[PDB]
């Protein structure tokens, strides 16, 4: 929107290419993560933790 | 434990699934907090097969209602057992009595 092109040009920032869609612990809750499990579809390169 | 009970609770815990009951009597040989290993007796043991029973206790695993279904051993190392006997308390059991 206008004033946003203004702000971005003023502060020499390049707008992000990709959008944050992380998983975050629901509000209020504590805990100690007792187990993680990664299910990689067949034909996709397993990352480090898998 | 129910400090004032009705005796229906030993059976509500055994006849359920949570408590880990021995199949064949014998004497305990190894008691980790994650397995029991029963040195089965010579009589109840089959004709030819190595008779030792292994009990893989079910440690912290989510239930349906998000609670925590667990199993702890109530046995001690080198202690006699008998058939139909508990080896591991489940979630809300105490030596085989249903403690809610």
């Amino acid at each position: 929107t206008p004033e946003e092109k203004l702000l971005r040009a003023i502060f020499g920032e390049k707008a992000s290419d990709v959008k944050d869609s992380s998983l975050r612990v629901p509000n209020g809750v504590s805990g100690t993560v007792i187990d993680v499990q990664v299910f990689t579809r067949d034909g996709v390169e397993k990352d480090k933790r898998a | 434990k129910p400090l004032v009970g009705t005796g229906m609770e030993r059976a509500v815990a055994v006849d359920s699934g949570v408590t880990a009951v021995a199949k064949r009597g014998g004497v305990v040989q190894y008691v980790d907090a994650s397995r029991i290993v029963i040195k089965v007796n010579e009589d109840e043991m089959y004709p030819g097969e190595a008779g030792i029973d292994i009990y893989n206790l079910t440690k912290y695993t989510r239930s349906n209602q998000n609670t925590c279904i667990n199993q702890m051993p109530c046995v001690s190392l080198g202690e006699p057992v008998e058939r139909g006997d508990v080896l591991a308390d489940g979630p809300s059991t105490d030596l085989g009595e249903l403690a809610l």
Binding site: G28 | P2, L3, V4, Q65, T67, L100
Partner: protein, 50 residues
């Protein structure tokens, strides 16, 4: 039989003990019941409610 059992231990027959009041330090008139009711914890937890 309950009274007979309470007499086995040296507790009182009525089951009613003189409780003091932990704040002011002065006895509650007219003795009160004390026993161990076995109490469950229903899972209507309040931090699944707020």
């Amino acid at each position: 039989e309950i009274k007979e059992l309470l007499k086995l231990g040296d507790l009182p027959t009525s089951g009613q003990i003189r409780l003091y009041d932990g704040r002011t330090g002065e006895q509650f008139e007219r003795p009160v019941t004390v026993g161990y009711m076995y109490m469950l914890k229903l899972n209507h937890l309040v931090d699944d409610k707020m």
